[PDB]
Design a protein around this ligand. Structure first.
Ligand SMILES: CCCCCCCCCCCCCC(=O)N[C@@H](CO)C[C@@H](O)c1ccccc1
Length: 236
């Protein structure tokens, strides 16, 4: 890439590829707090100076869609309002490259506290597979940056985030005369969110809200991808 954020991008992608994919089922620092179908949501309870920082990690398996398609839909701001429910307003501050943009958005008051805004670079990347026996990996990384055109606000507390949707397509070609259809593909998703609320709020409530809102998002967003891609040619 040309843009000034290319080095930071690579470091964020690499951290997610090494630390975010790590299996969290047997990790006793993590707690499985939501299960429904193929979806599991885990959290690690962390606070600094009384501020709840709990890392969130979800895993999902979604039939009939690819990692490329799920990542495309997650990244593409032209469809954000089709699925996102926690945002009041957003706009693109800057386009850095064809796969990378900076976004400013304000969120609905889902917490018992001042309204939050966030200012993040959103980038979509493909990580090639080492062999044709393995899945290619598609990732969208959303991470807080600074921008002159979006300074701190009077009205909102500036949250900071480090989020990744990491997706891999598994395929199971059919036995004989049939061509591959969407019944033969499944997308494995890992979604990780590390959110700094930028100020204090009761932890009990913040945790209740995260337990509610992330599984809600994931079900609605993945369903939306399934609907919008149904009966379409598969994008690997
Ligand atoms: C910025 C803190 C204010 C929101 C408080 C938490 C609400 C839970 C949101 C669940 C849905 C996450 C959807 C999600 O991942 N959304 C994208 C696109 O809007 C931006 C994102 O990477 C993010 C993650 C987490 C918080 C805000 C924004």
């Amino acid at each position: 890439g040309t843009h000034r954020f290319v080095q930071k991008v690579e470091e964020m992608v690499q951290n997610h590829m090494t630390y975010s994919l790590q299996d969290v089922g047997g990790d006793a620092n993590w707690q499985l707090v939501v299960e429904e179908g193929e979806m599991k949501v885990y959290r690690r309870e962390v606070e600094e100076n009384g501020i709840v920082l709990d890392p969130l990690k979800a895993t999902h398996a979604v039939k009939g869609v690819t990692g490329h398609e799920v990542c495309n839909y997650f990244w593409n701001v032209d469809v954000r309002n089709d699925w996102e429910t926690t945002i009041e307003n957003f706009h693109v501050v800057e386009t850095l490259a064809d796969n990378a943009i900076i976004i400013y958005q304000t969120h609905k008051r889902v917490w018992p506290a001042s309204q939050r805004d966030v200012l993040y670079l959103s980038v979509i990347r493909k990580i090639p597979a080492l062999t044709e026996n393995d899945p290619e990996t598609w990732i969208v990384c959303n991470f807080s940056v600074d921008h002159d055109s979006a300074p701190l606000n009077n009205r909102c507390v500036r949250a900071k985030i480090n989020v990744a949707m990491i997706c891999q397509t598994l395929v199971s070609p059919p036995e004989g005369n049939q061509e591959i259809s969407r019944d033969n593909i499944l997308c494995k998703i890992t979604y990780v969110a590390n959110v700094n609320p930028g100020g204090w709020a009761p932890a009990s409530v913040l945790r209740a809200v995260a337990k509610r809102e992330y599984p809600k998002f994931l079900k609605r967003f993945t369903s939306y991808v399934q609907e919008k891609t149904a009966g379409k040619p598969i994008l690997f």
